Design a protein around this ligand. Structure first.
Ligand SMILES: [Cl-]
Ligand SMILES: [Cl-]
Ligand SMILES: [Fe+2]
Ligand SMILES: [Fe+2]
Lengths: 497, 497
């Protein structure tokens, strides 16, 4: 077999990106300032963190084993619990004490035959008394919210119709449904999309098989009262390329950004309309809703070139690091329209942004608040001279949060400081009575001065000021998505506004 | 109650001394070089690490909750397990989420009445299939060697005759006895010493009550074939001082360093002879043995002033930090002699030293190898300009290990580097056939450059060279004592040479 390295090497595992790989507890975290005592619940986030050095040199960030952090809040006290998802990959590599899984989504490079290749490292969501650790190439892994024990690969009582479950399911605050899909739903390189939903009782509701015009990456999707929307990233899969040791994904400059629209209830595969947006990168969906006219307003991050530059086109053509900006775009779609080409989107702010969150109490309905990460290159905001040589690479950079009031157009910006970067934020309703977007925002900071992580607690009344700064004595590697589970919500999801 | 701080403050918890307070696992530690594949067993060490900020400002290092590290070695792979001892202090403070125990060994400063005040933070030893977490003011706490679960306060099947159990019991390699004592054996300020031993079957053998000439700290002791030896540190306890909120310990310039000698078997309390060594600090015992004439050779660290300078005399007189050196002394004692005053000791090396270890296969018999920590002020050996502002305070400093061959007089020195300091080393016999002092030495390093801990593995054939450097991604706070439990030893202790 290819030799297993006994320590981490390369930029992807240097400085702040160096794996820690700790599992266990740190109770009674140090706090500067004061955590509002009314906050009760858990902040769950996932980070890719390779448990063993890869036999593949400079293995990307996003191929790392899913490690779950829980920050448990009560009466102004907070405890950390940390545990790896027991994926087939994790268990078999732990048993062998060496890496066995190969390149991102390429089973032809694996040193052994895996049934499930999930790193479960993209998102961690609450559903019917379990956590679901998500990776879009795989079913979810079910975990205990209290202990972070892994129950195992989850198939919804044998109801799961798809080989794949999206990292970005949507929770309808009115119907209490989990709205899901998977792409490559019948295996590597398949154009099959399976759209499916589960009622609050755990019974499967919708199951509609449709066909993608290309085998493109559908990372995120959008749900409205009457429609589900599938934005396709112009990254395309060729199984024959994979069989020769090539990348699962390759950029295609020659195709539009397809946006499929399907009736949410009772539809057939053929009812989908593949609208064609100007060529570009489909980033994370903030939210979608139908306006008075019944037109879909799709608000999402959108870039004009390949954000995933490490997967260029067939001729190796693509952007260089930190060159591509994503902007907060609004697309208008009419399911009635027979005109497939879509107009250029309007932009809601100027900022280079990603990781948009809304008050999920209005998810699938009209929202007037969005919180999102920003990357401001204006000199001084980030001390790049100090940070870059300590940062490593392979992970997206964010040097602030922004709150947009969609009505007033007002923007508040949180700037943690010149030697700190942020992850994805969560929003917490102040209480079950609070107005949309009124309450607390939490965000994990990387402090390159201390080489330590911090959890910032912000009040939405003044996003510029830290109410509390929770000082972790370890590093938490830059992570992906996270979610709030409020103690006052019995099913883990907030009540409709 | 006095307010509980919500973050650590003061020099005792700054830089490398900042508590991490993590419990759990880090498997498959990163290795530079190669761990000899024949090494099989566990390195256990204990560190004081306050779980909650003290209500007492600048609480000393040595009042911190005992946290146990296990480094589990097999086939050139190593795993870390880390867990706090579940002392009464730990459990009740965890429940209250605030510090409750007060000043070092002063129950009159506690915010609640404790039955047991142990932090179990001084030593961790193997006895009959359990770990014993030791603190000289308390009985041991029993723990699972595999999981580091705390069983609870241990009384040897109700046989423990003393309120107190020394942090420095001795294991007789021939008789397989654990030889023990406790001072202040009948409570605060008592001059009662209880000498007791346990056979390999767990049955108590010796139990002899004797009286100390003063209520002095007896931190360490020595065992020979026929004698047990009690060196008294001129730190003296006054219960009346404690009742007013004063220190348990206060230096007395007016007394000698008493060295009690008692027949090991069948003695009465009155059989003890209190020999009087020149005034000084009794450091850790390397080993003691009877020579051809039946005279006790006691080899131990010995200083001419108060090493514990934070506990000065009644008028606040004592040394300043880093002023007092301890030297590797040999004292000669004859139990037959009626001459109580002892000659000045001969010195085996020039180095400022402490934490002596021998090949414990010759413990209580003649030894010709000693490994010990050194603090060398020779310019360049430690980059004090870089280290000191990152180091914090309250913990002893060591910038190398030395191996002394007592026959040849040869000294090998391990120097980890200018920006690294060491803890206490362990010695591992190469195999059950190896000569005295032949095998491996392990020592935990603080790397002030990375602000990370490392575990160095050395071969006794060349102590200057690291065979392996195990890179921990976290800090382990400067600790106290540790012990090797070899897999090949059924009762956890090596076979007589
Ligand atoms: Cl598990
Ligand atoms: Cl326990
Ligand atoms: Fe995502
Ligand atoms: Fe000691």
């Amino acid at each position: 077999l290819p030799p297993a390295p006994r320590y981490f090497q390369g930029e992807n595992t240097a400085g702040f990106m160096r794996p820690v790989r700790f599992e266990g507890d740190i109770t009674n975290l140090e706090v500067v300032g004061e955590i509002p005592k009314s906050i009760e619940g858990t902040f769950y986030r996932v980070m890719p963190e390779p448990h063993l050095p890869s036999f593949i040199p400079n293995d990307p960030w996003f191929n790392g084993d899913g490690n779950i952090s829980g920050f448990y809040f009560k009466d102004g006290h907070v405890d950390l619990k940390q545990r790896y998802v027991r994926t087939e990959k994790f268990v078999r590599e732990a048993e062998a004490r060496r890496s066995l899984l190969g390149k991102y989504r390429n089973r032809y490079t694996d040193l052994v035959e895996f049934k499930i290749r999930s790193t479960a490292n993209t998102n961690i969501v609450y559903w019917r008394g379990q956590l679901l650790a998500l990776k879009e190439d795989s079913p979810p892994y079910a975990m205990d919210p209290e202990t972070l024990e892994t129950f195992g690969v989850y198939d919804f009582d044998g109801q799961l119709p798809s080989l794949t479950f999206t990292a970005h399911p949507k929770f309808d605050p009115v119907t209490r449904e989990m709205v899901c899909f998977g792409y490559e739903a019948k295996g590597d390189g398949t154009r099959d999309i399976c759209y499916y939903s589960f009622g609050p009782d755990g019974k499967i509701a919708e199951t509609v098989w449709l066909v993608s015009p290309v085998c493109g990456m559908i990372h995120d999707f959008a749900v409205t009262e009457n429609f589900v929307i599938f934005p396709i990233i112009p990254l395309v899969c060729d199984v024959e390329r994979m069989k020769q040791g090539g990348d699962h994904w390759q950029w295609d400059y020659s195709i539009p950004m397809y946006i499929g629209v399907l009736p949410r209830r009772g539809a057939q595969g053929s009812d989908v309309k593949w609208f064609e947006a100007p060529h570009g990168f489909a980033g994370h969906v903030a939210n979608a809703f139908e306006d008075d006219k019944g037109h879909i307003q799709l608000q999402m991050a959108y870039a004009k070139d390949n954000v995933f530059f490490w997967w260029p086109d067939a001729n190796g053509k693509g952007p260089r690091p930190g060159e591509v900006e994503a902007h907060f775009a609004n697309f208008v779609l009419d399911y009635q329209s027979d005109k497939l080409p879509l107009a250029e989107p309007t932009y809601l702010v100027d900022d280079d942004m990603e990781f948009p969150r809304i008050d999920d109490r209005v998810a699938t309905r009209k929202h007037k608040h969005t919180f999102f990460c920003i990357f401001d290159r204006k000199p001084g905001v980030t001390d790049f001279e100090f940070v870059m040589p300590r940062a490593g690479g392979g992970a997206p950079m964010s040097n602030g949060l922004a709150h947009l009031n969609h009505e007033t157009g007002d923007i508040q910006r949180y700037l943690p400081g010149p030697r700190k970067l942020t992850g994805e934020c969560i929003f917490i309703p102040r209480n079950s009575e609070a107005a949309e977007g009124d309450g607390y925002v939490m965000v994990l900071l990387a402090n390159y001065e201390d080489m330590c992580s911090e959890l910032a607690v912000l009040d939405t009344k003044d996003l510029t000021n830290e109410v509390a700064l929770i000082k972790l004595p370890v590093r938490l590697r830059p992570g992906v998505h996270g979610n709030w589970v409020d103690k006052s919500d019995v099913d883990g999801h907030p009540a409709p506004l």
